[PDB]
Copies of this chain bind each other. A is one copy, B any other.
Amino acid sequence: GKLTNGALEASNVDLSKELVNMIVAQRNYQSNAQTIKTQDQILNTLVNL
């Protein structure tokens, strides 16, 4: 490609989409932790029986 003098290439990170992805990943993590908690409860019932 062409070189442009006197200019710098900024990053290609858009903050809005990254924030939305952070929100979605937070929700996924919380759901997975809920699954972990569910498994923790089934083994408790069996151990106690």
Contacts and interface: CB of A to CB of B under 8 A. Distances in A.
Interface of A: 15, 18-20, 22-23, 26-31, 33-38, 40-43, 45-47, 49
Contacts of A40: 23, 27, 49
Contact of A31 (B19, B31, B34): B19
Contacts of A26: 38, 41-42
Contacts of A29: 42, 45
Given A19-B31, A26-B42, 18 more contacts: A15-B27, A18-B31, A19-B34, A20-B36, A22-B38, A23-B40, A26-B38, A26-B41, A27-B43, A27-B47, A29-B45, A30-B43, A30-B45, A31-B43, A31-B47, A33-B49, A34-B47, A40-B49
